[PDB]
Design a protein around this ligand. Structure first.
Ligand SMILES: NC(=O)C1=CN([C@@H]2O[C@H](COP(=O)(O)OP(=O)(O)OC[C@H]3O[C@@H](n4cnc5c(N)ncnc54)[C@H](O)[C@@H]3O)[C@@H](O)[C@H]2O)[C@@H](O)CC1
Ligand SMILES: NC(=O)C1=CN([C@@H]2O[C@H](COP(=O)(O)OP(=O)(O)OC[C@H]3O[C@@H](n4cnc5c(N)ncnc54)[C@H](O)[C@@H]3O)[C@@H](O)[C@H]2O)[C@@H](O)CC1
Ligand SMILES: NC(=O)C1=CN([C@@H]2O[C@H](COP(=O)(O)OP(=O)(O)OC[C@H]3O[C@@H](n4cnc5c(N)ncnc54)[C@H](O)[C@@H]3O)[C@@H](O)[C@H]2O)[C@@H](O)CC1
Ligand SMILES: NC(=O)C1=CN([C@@H]2O[C@H](COP(=O)(O)OP(=O)(O)OC[C@H]3O[C@@H](n4cnc5c(N)ncnc54)[C@H](O)[C@@H]3O)[C@@H](O)[C@H]2O)C=CC1
Ligand SMILES: NC(=O)C1=CN([C@@H]2O[C@H](COP(=O)(O)OP(=O)(O)OC[C@H]3O[C@@H](n4cnc5c(N)ncnc54)[C@H](O)[C@@H]3O)[C@@H](O)[C@H]2O)C=CC1
Ligand SMILES: NC(=O)C1=CN([C@@H]2O[C@H](COP(=O)(O)OP(=O)(O)OC[C@H]3O[C@@H](n4cnc5c(N)ncnc54)[C@H](O)[C@@H]3O)[C@@H](O)[C@H]2O)C=CC1
Ligand SMILES: Nc1ncnc2c1ncn2[C@@H]1O[C@H](COP(=O)(O)OP(=O)(O)O)[C@@H](O)[C@H]1O
Ligand SMILES: Nc1ncnc2c1ncn2[C@@H]1O[C@H](COP(=O)(O)OP(=O)(O)O)[C@@H](O)[C@H]1O
Ligand SMILES: Nc1ncnc2c1ncn2[C@@H]1O[C@H](COP(=O)(O)OP(=O)(O)O)[C@@H](O)[C@H]1O
Ligand SMILES: [K+]
Ligand SMILES: [K+]
Ligand SMILES: [K+]
Ligand SMILES: [Mg+2]
Ligand SMILES: [Mg+2]
Ligand SMILES: [Mg+2]
Lengths: 489, 7, 489, 489, 7, 7, 7
């Protein structure tokens, strides 16, 4: 993005003042769209000394004469050249500027435009800057942030001591990672992405994308009329234990509800019988076990069951103990099919095994399992997309790191998912996702594509729940999945 | 809805 | 309340006649609201000699000239000063008063205003007073009671020999306990609470409240967007036996449907498998038992399962025998987590154990289990809020005493719940409640708050059932819970 | 306007490239608004070598990558600096430019953007430029003109040999006279006025305005509740003859329908009786005449009738002969009230009389009467706003020159009216207007204000006619007037 | 609509 | 209606 | 609805 602006000025030849003008007017238009007619409102524009503030000056100047009142509070010391220019325009146009903030000031304005810091923020905000942000946050006024709410680090989404909470953020060219990852995602409020005149080839060159409806629509496999269950693939899910008899059911149904032709579960007897008593469509193979858990004595039966399926999912509700550990690593070492490795299969996994595998793999950890997997803290891995990138690349796999914003990466391409809600914050929801991913691989999507489509549809199904989200359970989510698919087209 | 255009 | 009137006159300085005027006109306005234009109706006002009757005289006087007909039947001997004053006003204004009731009289009137007795009722009603109340009750006329239907003891809700059955009750300042507890709640009909000019600080000073929509809305925990199942807590439910394989399922789902992140049941094998066959989202741990019931041999397994959960519910469908008794009391004595103690765990409980506990507890008895618990009759404990108060305070716990009006108390604060209907009068409904309470504790509400929110939402879900209430079952109630939550906001 | 751009660059400091960028993007946004999503369309941008063409290059460049196809046909020889700059940007961005137009080219495009000439057009278009405009006009494609359709002289509305016919014109800052006067008004199609960043004080400084709904709403006199016919004034209308018995009725009703309190007509007997037989509310004074026309023998009767009225309208249907001439000029010379001089009173008027008058006057000629009045051809005066200005100023009057676009001027302020339709192209419609103007003067609006409000409301009433406009008659128009007023607020 | 009455 | 903004 | 107020 810094790249993008520079190239658009330096190689394409667009005057930096023109980009700055387009930036500011796009903020005005976004506010009009969100607030209706702007002439009834009084606007307090907060401008730093950088180009974020310059953008602010453009906004203030364009409100002059058209709205009830404009005031700029200039908070910087030095001004960049474009900020200086635009400051001089605002003044020539008759705009009033002050240099000291008095708490009482929010009293006489309806909208605060936050142009203090954007992508040029470095390190923590303190001093006057922090007080003013805390005042704005306590004011209950409408807050529109220019580019990113001031205080959010645009590369990570972290709050640098304190940050503005916006009702509306107008960002330029492309969403920034700090709009996408929390807490920043929360502080952004409603996000508008404005076209300010970058050539389209530059906008498209960016390595990380948010997963969209259009991308997922184009990835959904085709349903030829002359087809049968074989057309849509077979999944084996190796799952469950005597502690967890339900997980396998949720995974298997996740596969069926996204359109897989045939799903076989392998589950310790008698827990395997639980699946068909809820959903008779599922096939649930009883695996004879010594203590209610998969072990090495079951290895050959499972490789045999895997011989004429398209994909194998393993992990949900297996339990984490040494017999499971032995079994999972020998299985994965010998299985020459794509694998979706989840849950307790991740908790026992030996990552050397992923390197010596010829067939592909998707790993689906929440941060707690990722932390354990790479031997780091939850805090070190949460939302750490570069870490996920390095791991996907080292181990020749797709890593789906699950959280309110899920990261899907293969080490080259990284995608962020922003669908879903807190109804998914409840056990079972991940077990469903695993089945969805395995299912899309069975139907012919690549691992990365299957994962992109699945995370998106899984979150969208949760949002379609009719009642309060907190009451959503995994069984209900399964039922919403084909509605999500329909609404997708 | 009138900042850019008048009809 | 007697306190309240006295202080409003004696310390704040409001003339008692003014309070009485505001009382009476608030009755007129409440009737207009309920009946439409009052001028088509004929009103028979029944006035005792107390201030309830004085309030009646204010009502009658204010109807003079505006309605088809007013008649007062004055039933008292002496009059209090404000009743005397208002009697004299009614007469000066031209109102007709008689002193003898003739059964034939109800014939020529449409509305009976019942101002015979309010909070000054002492002991049983007999003699003329009883006959007249029984006549009014047989008349099929519209009955509006001033303050409380005459015959209801305003401190308990008991009928003192006989009582008026009202279509509408207008009470002053705050609801009286006798409007809230049955039978009085039934005899009150539709209740309006009128502001007659008490200062608000006095109205708010009252120790007992009815649980309202607004109170429950403010107590619902937050759902931060950046969250996961851990954010919303973990519950262990120790439940079931070979006699009762279903109870644990209803408790576990009750927890999940109010937004708990993770629910583990511990249930004797093979009954534990019943839970996941209905709801695979649940985790149901098989507990190995000798005869199909928890005993001391299971104590250590359960303490272990309790180590990284937030709350433990125990009791639903455990069975009541000596092995269960030993197990429950040793468990609760050692468990250092908040406990929700229900059902058969209450039936075996040794209350010394609650005193020696450092962690908190909520007990959820119906009157039959409370009676047994304190060794009294059902009749002695039913609706006995002072008894519940004393018990909560002695044992350092929250007591939720369940009935059509549920009492929630911690010995200091007492709350009454008035949502729900007879569809909850059917096995399973309590087992659901236990899970709901455990769930809200898991999410961070205090025991008392979790219980307040739960009793309210549980009754409101029952009322949302689409078909006749009597056909409601606990499974359907679970499905209604997230609708209740949504309607709450 | 040339003034405006220059000052905005040279004194306010706005880079001319920035104004040009805002110009072009405002064209893109106006097209999106009118056409919906632009990505389905192919655009042929026609660019001259001036700044109009530069604006075109901005448009083309901003469509690159977002629409099906862009092509520029560059038609100029030299480029101005901003056109050169923007040409270079379009190319860098990957835009394709050709320099020769092939008739077959319109075939493969859906929208022609016309940026050949704007306000820099000088003299007639011939050569390649004319052929290309004639091709576009024969193509049936959607045509969007940048600033003004190429070929319209922006100061007069004249076509310079040939001109583009647009579906949409996006003009910058303010409407140009050439959008307002015909034929240019016709060639403009739907007109959008874009704010491109001129300071508002400059935009407002312009001497000529289009009459708007908001201006007319603020001018409508107040209707105090405690009022009577005297509050709203009295009008005398001196009108009619034995040739024209209807004109006076239409004028008198025009006065009443805009809210005048009292209208007296003076009309030769027996033609005066026609008025009250249609509208009995009118007062119609029989004037005794020798041959059916006003003459000098009626002068004193009319001055007498004028003594306690607020305004006098004279002219509609008087007839044009020497007795009328003598009478009108002696009357106007002596009448010391505001006069509305219309129709045959204009045809006989001696303009020296307007100079020697102390009281005010509004003249309401169509071009045929203006031509005669200043002794010029219809062609010389039609839409000649500078001529009208000079005449209003020389004679101390308001001149309302009537046509599809009516000019109202007092020599300092000139207003253009753009309401109305061809249903007003039918006798009687002017006679109604005269009464409307006299009425508003009677109610207290200045002559210029009365005329501004009247021309607007008169055209708006015609547009409210329910059936085909061509069937509208003056009687129906009278009925529509109070609907126009209501819709105005 | 709540000054006089609460339900 | 998408030239300026994407949501 | 007319005991308190007439309009
Ligand atoms: N119905 C069922 O049968 C269910 C079984 N489940 C199974 O239970 C087993 C254990 O899975 P768990 O995820 O509970 O525990 P894990 O042991 O795999 O997770 C490690 C710890 O990380 C923490 N954690 C979880 N999500 C986190 C997040 N988003 N951010 C930070 N920390 C987080 C948890 O507190 C957990 O204790 C798996 O086999 C899983 O399939 C779960 O899917 C729950 C539902
Ligand atoms: N589906 C299931 O598995 C169910 C199991 N249940 C379990 O059955 C066991 C016994 O519970 P119960 O309540 O039946 O019996 P309890 O032995 O706990 O109750 C004692 C007696 O009190 C009486 N009683 C119940 N509610 C009363 C009230 N509101 N007022 C006055 N008296 C009342 C009953 O007649 C009952 O016989 C518990 O473990 C409970 O969890 C019940 O929840 C019913 C549903
Ligand atoms: N119902 C009636 O009694 C009517 C009587 N009318 C009266 O008829 C008399 C003559 O008025 P006229 O306007 O017919 O003729 P005038 O003699 O005043 O007009 C001179 C000529 O100019 C031409 N002309 C009219 N409008 C023109 C325009 N917009 N552009 C160019 N040329 C135009 C006409 O061809 C007309 O012959 C007036 O006293 C007028 O009040 C007219 O108002 C028609 C209705
Ligand atoms: N391009 C547009 O311009 C913006 C980029 O403009 P730039 O001028 O690059 O940066 P910027 O306007 O985001 O911020 C740079 C300014 O912030 C100040 N600053 C940075 N971190 C600070 C801290 N921690 N405490 C106090 N002051 C601090 C710097 O001194 C400088 O004036 C984009 O966000 C976009 O709006
Ligand atoms: N404050 C308003 O006034 C009321 C309180 O007024 P008070 O005068 O305190 O009491 P009150 O008007 O409720 O009743 C007191 C009257 O009831 C009579 N009474 C009480 N119990 C009786 C019984 N069991 N049999 C026969 N007569 C009986 C008493 O002699 C006295 O006249 C409130 O309810 C409210 O309406
Ligand atoms: N300001 C924006 O720029 C425009 C003004 O730009 P300018 O460069 O002032 O003028 P312009 O772009 O309207 O037109 C000037 C150009 O037209 C050519 N031209 C003018 N009359 C012509 C004729 N009769 N035949 C052939 N060529 C002719 C001139 O040589 C020059 O290249 C405004 O309309 C607005 O769009
Ligand atoms: N607040 C939230 N917003 C969006 N998605 C969520 C949220 N909480 C959880 N999820 C999604 O729910 C699923 C949780 O998976 P996992 O943590 O494996 O839990 P489980 O094993 O409990 O099924 C993931 O897809 C995760 O990204
Ligand atoms: N008529 C009623 N109105 C409102 N609530 C009721 C009614 N009958 C029962 N309930 C509620 O239903 C639940 C019954 O719980 P409990 O008596 O423990 O029965 P169970 O063990 O049968 O589930 C309690 O919350 C109680 O207050
Ligand atoms: N095509 C048109 N569009 C708008 N207004 C029109 C049109 N034709 C005529 N008018 C209006 O109708 C009225 C005609 O007045 P006038 O020419 O004095 O005719 P008359 O004497 O026939 O009543 C004027 O207000 C004129 O501006
Ligand atoms: K900012
Ligand atoms: K009473
Ligand atoms: K043009
Ligand atoms: Mg999981
Ligand atoms: Mg119970
Ligand atoms: Mg005319």
């Amino acid at each position: 993005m810094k790249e993008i602006d520079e190239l658009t000025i330096k190689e394409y030849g667009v005057d930096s003042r023109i980009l700055m003008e387009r930036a500011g007017i796009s903020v005005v238009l976004a506010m009009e769209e969100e607030l209706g007619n702007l002439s009834d409102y009084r606007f307090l524009v907060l401008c730093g000394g950088g180009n974020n503030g310059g953008d602010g000056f453009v906004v203030a100047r364009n409100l002059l004469g058209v709205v009830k009142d404009v005031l700029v509070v200039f908070l910087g010391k030095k001004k960049t050249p474009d900020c200086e220019y635009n400051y001089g325009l605002y003044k020539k146009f008759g705009g009033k500027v002050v240099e000291q903030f008095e708490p009482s000031i929010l009293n006489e304005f309806d909208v605060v435009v936050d142009a203090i810091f954007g992508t040029g923020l470095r390190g923590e905000i303190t001093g006057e800057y922090a007080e003013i942000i805390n005042l704005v946050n306590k004011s209950g006024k409408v807050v529109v942030s220019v580019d990113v709410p001031s205080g959010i680090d645009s590369n990570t989404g972290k709050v640098l001591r304190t940050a503005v909470k916006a009702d509306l953020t107008v960002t330029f060219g492309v969403p920034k990672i700090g709009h996408i990852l929390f807490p920043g995602r929360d502080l952004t409020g409603k996000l508008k992405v404005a076209n300010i005149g970058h050539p389209v080839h530059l906008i498209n060159s960016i390595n990380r994308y948010v997963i969209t409806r259009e991308m997922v629509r184009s990835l959904l496999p085709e349903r030829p009329r002359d087809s049968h269950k074989g057309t849509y693939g077979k999944v084996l899910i190796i799952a469950g234990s005597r502690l967890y008899s339900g997980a396998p059911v949720l995974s298997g149904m996740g596969s069926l509800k996204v359109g897989t032709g045939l799903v076989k579960l392998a589950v310790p007897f008698p827990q395997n019988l639980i699946a068909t008593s809820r959903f008779p469509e599922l096939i649930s193979v009883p695996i004879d076990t010594e203590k209610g858990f998969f072990s090495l004595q079951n290895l050959q039966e499972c490789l045999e069951l895997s011989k004429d399926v398209d994909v194998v999912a393993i992990g949900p509700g297996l339990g984490n103990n040494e017999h499971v550990r032995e079994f999972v690593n020998e299985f994965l070492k010998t299985l020459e099919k794509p694998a979706v490795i989840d849950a307790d299969a991740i908790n026992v996994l030996d990552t050397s095994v992923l390197k010596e595998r010829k067939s592909p793999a998707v790993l689906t950890p929440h941060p707690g399992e990722m932390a354990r997997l790479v031997k780091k803290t939850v805090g070190d891995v949460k939302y750490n997309y570069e870490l996920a990138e390095e791991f996907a690349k080292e181990n020749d796999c797709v890593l789906v790191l699950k959280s309110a914003t899920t990261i899907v990466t293969d080490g080259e391409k990284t995608l962020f998912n922003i669908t879903g809600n807190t109804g998914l914050s409840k056990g079972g929801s991940g077990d469903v996702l695993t089945g969805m991913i395995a299912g899309f691989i069975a139907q012919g999507l690549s691992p990365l594509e299957a994962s992109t489509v699945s995370v998106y549809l899984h979150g969208f199904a949760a949002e379609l729940f009719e009642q309060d989200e907190r009451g959503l359970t995994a069984s209900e989510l399964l039922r919403l999945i084909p509605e999500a698919i329909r609404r997708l087209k | 809805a009138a900042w850019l255009f008048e009809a």
